[PDB]
Structures are given as structure tokens and as C-alpha cells.
Amino acid sequence: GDTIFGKIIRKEIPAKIIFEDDRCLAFHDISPQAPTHFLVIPKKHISQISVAEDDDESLLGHLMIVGKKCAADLGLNKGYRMVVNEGSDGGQSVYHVHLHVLGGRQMHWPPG
């Protein structure tokens, strides 16, 4: 089923967009957990990483490459953390695959 991230992709509700191409979108998280906290999402509706297909491998890697390029452009020269949540134990909040990128502060261990 549709999600709020689908609405963001379709431009039906606002988001602070950092980068877009034909296959993904990066935008600042509405509930940031670090001075910089953004998401990179595919335009294809994959509901969760556990259901991603083998043919999705390059697309998933593209999310990470876009994420690292956006992080550099946003000035995260001291580093950052990338996160994908799956399911209830993973704390996944929206059932549309999304890569979190967080930085601008020391990230701690354990990662939640």
C-alpha cells in the first residue's frame, strides 16, 4: 500500500529535497536525530529490505552512493552513519525502503 514516502516522491506533500534523479530521491528527515539527518529512497516501491530482489542490487547500491555524495555535499567531512531498518525489531517506521544518513555529531555505540 501507499505510504507518506510515496506522497513525497509524487510531490503531493512538501519535503526539503537534497537530490533527485530518475530512480531515487534524497530529502531531510522530518524528525532529525543529528544536526544532519536525511533519507535516500528509491522511486520503486520496495516495502522493506527483506523483500528486495536480486535485480535490485544496483539500485540499492545507488542509494548508498547517492547518500555518500550528498553527505559530502552537506559538509559531513568528519563522517556519518548509514542505517536501514527492517521490521518491528529494526524500528522500521515507513514500509518503503529508506536509507538514513546521520552526521554532524559523534554517533555512539551500540547503534540503538
Ligand X SMILES: Nc1ncnc2c1ncn2[C@@H]1O[C@H](CNS(=O)(=O)NC(=O)CCCC[C@@H]2SC[C@@H]3NC(=O)N[C@@H]32)[C@@H](O)[C@H]1O
Considering beta carbons, is residue 71 or 98 the nearer one to ligand X?
A: 98
Closest to 63 in 3D by CA, of 10, 31, 27:
27
- Structure-derived torsion over alpha carbons of residues 7, 96, 21, 76, reported in degrees to the nearest 10: 110
User: Cα 42 from chain centroid?
Assistant: 9
Instruction: Name which of residues 34 to 93 contact its own copies (CB under 8 A).
Output: 34, 49-50, 52, 54, 56-62, 64-65, 67-68, 71-72, 76, 78-92
- Binding residue (CB under 8 A) for its own copies from 33, 44, 73, 75: 33
Instruction: Name which of residues 26 to 85 contact ligand X (CB under 6 A).
Output: 29-31, 39, 85
Catalytically annotated residue among 37, 96, 98, 108: 98
Report the alpha-carbon distance of residue 102 to residue 76 in Å, rounded: 9
Q: Which residues are annotated as a binding site for AMP?
A: 29-30, 85, 91-93, 98-100
